[PDB]
Amino acid sequence: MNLTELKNTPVSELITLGENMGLENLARMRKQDIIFAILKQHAKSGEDIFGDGVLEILQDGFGFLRSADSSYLAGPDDIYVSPSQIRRFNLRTGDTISGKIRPPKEGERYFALLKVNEVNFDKPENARNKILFENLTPLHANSRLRMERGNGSTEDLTARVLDLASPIGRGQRGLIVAPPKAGKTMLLQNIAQSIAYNHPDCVLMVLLIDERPEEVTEMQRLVKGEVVASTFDEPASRHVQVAEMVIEKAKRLVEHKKDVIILLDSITRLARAYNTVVPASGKVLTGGVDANALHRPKRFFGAARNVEEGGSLTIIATALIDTGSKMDEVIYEEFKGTGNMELHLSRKIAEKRVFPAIDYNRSGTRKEELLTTQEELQKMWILRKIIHPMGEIDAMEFLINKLAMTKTNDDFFEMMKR
């Protein structure tokens, strides 16, 4: 049967399937071992087995078709592709490969590819002729990703406030300065739903680094799209592997003229994982961070650009501030001027139990003339002008109750000018 549907079924269904297939002692094994045993038993019959995944290329030369269902974790069910296929079809890291597979032979551990059917959601001949991501010329964001639901519900209120604070464009480089206990998680949640509703064409990618399992489960349950995660139980190498796989897949999708959105949670954890995993360079800055360590996350962060040829890759990451560790303070300090979109959250608003906790007087974008129209820009600047002298929490609640009875944004502007 298809491999991608076996990884979506609940464990009880898989156990029942293996039991009625003739297998036993499957209950106490892991999910991946159950899948591998079921696949081997089915292939014993000799039927056609289909599968799909993302190619990860090891240092030796061969690759593995990791699956996004297990957040690109190594396991016995991964399909092994020899350098034969990497040389034959010019495949880089992150190419989505789908095709038939065969059971392992004697002396072979993992399953092997048999006949590639689609590469990067496209025919191999057209896939091998695409220009590499590095050769694509960067450009400023011009098309705006409007994230107003329009239903007028209380959930859309934070999205409307965010849109009035800092517009989001395709290919934008976003950074959120979220102090602890400032409602960052629900902000990411509503951003994810707004993106999944307003722009179904853009590919949504949410990756969690150094998070608790409950957050992973809730994100998988409520966010529609592709969500991968790396809990704090797994070592730093797992964080590095997940981040690299996601960014490579995003680049390979953008090369096919597609819009990709990546919500990074969070940048400081990835930087700390890189600092832990990198070899020491002999020069260590304050807080215990290596100079060469902090360069690795910049490759991830710098990939956000608007491709002139077609499509774009936008990364809306978040940072940690005043968490008590000077390492994260330094990491934020060096990530300061590297993003065109900045969103400032504050603890003072959150402790008053009024949401969202966006600091409007200090959060905004750069080169916003391209994203918005002329009259919209005029109204936004007028609203910023009137908000500017007011106090922080005062400006926030003024924005909240000005947006209370309003359903959309334009009518709010009309009643503001009145």
Residue 2 binding result from a copy of itself, other proteins, none, given CB thresholds of 5 to 8 Å by partner type: none
Q: How far is the CB of 279 from other proteins (least distance, A)?
A: 34
Token pair of 28, please? Answer: 């106490």
Written as one letter, the residue type at 36 is F
- Our finding on whether 102 is near other proteins (CB under 8 A) is yes
Q: How far apart are CA 111 and CA 50, in angstroms?
A: 11
- Our finding on whether 21 is near other proteins (CB under 8 A) is no
For a copy of itself, the closer of residues 58 and 132 by Cβ is 132
For other proteins, the closer of residues 24 and 60 by Cβ is 24
Task: Pick one of 46, 107, 324, 389: the residue that binds a copy of itself (CB under 8 A).
Answer: 324
Q: How far apart are CA 388 and CA 391, in angstroms?
A: 8
| 183 is known to lie in a ligand binding site | yes
Contacts made by residues 106-112, CB under 8 angstroms, sequence distance 24+: 108/80, 109/76, 109/80, 110/64, 110/76, 110/77, 110/78, 110/79, 110/80, 111/39, 111/49, 111/51, 111/77, 111/78, 111/79, 111/80, 112/79, 112/80, 112/81, 112/82
| 298 is known to lie in a ligand binding site | no
Q: How far is the CB of 90 from other proteins (least distance, A)?
A: 9
Residues of the chain immediately before an interruption (C to N > 2.5 Å): none
Site map (CB under 8 A) of a copy of itself, residues 147-186, x = contact:
--------------------------x------x------
| 181 is known to lie in a ligand binding site | yes
Residue 154 burial by Cβ neighbours in a 10 Å radius (0-12, 13-18, 19+): exposed
For other proteins, the closer of residues 128 and 407 by Cβ is 128
* DSSP per-residue string spanning 217-257: HHHHHHS-SEEEEEETTS-HHHHHHHHHHHHHHHHHHHHTS
Written as one letter, the residue type at 101 is I
- Our finding on whether 125 is near other proteins (CB under 8 A) is yes
- Our finding on whether 38 is near other proteins (CB under 8 A) is no
Q: How far is the CB of 12 from other proteins (least distance, A)?
A: 18
How much of the chain is in helix, strand and coil states, percent to nearest 5?
A: 40, 20, 40
- Our finding on whether 410 is near other proteins (CB under 8 A) is no
- Our finding on whether 256 is near a copy of itself (CB under 8 A) is no
- Our finding on whether 128 is near other proteins (CB under 8 A) is yes
| 170 is known to lie in a ligand binding site | yes
# chain residues binding other proteins, by CB under 8 A = 18
Q: How far apart are CA 237 and CA 257, in angstroms?
A: 31
Spacing of C-alpha 218 from chain mean position: 15
- Our finding on whether 280 is near a copy of itself (CB under 8 A) is yes
Q: How far apart are CA 284 and CA 278, in angstroms?
A: 12
Q: Which residues bind a copy of itself (CB under 8 A)?
A: 11-12, 15, 25, 27-31, 90, 92, 128-132, 134-135, 137-140, 173, 180, 212-214, 216-218, 231-236, 276, 280, 283, 285-286, 288, 291-292, 295, 298-299, 302, 305-306, 323-325, 333, 336-338, 340, 351, 353, 381, 388
Binding residues for ATP: 169-174, 181-186, 212
Residues in contact with other proteins by the rule CB under 8 A: 24-25, 48, 81-82, 84-85, 88, 100, 102, 112-116, 124-125, 128
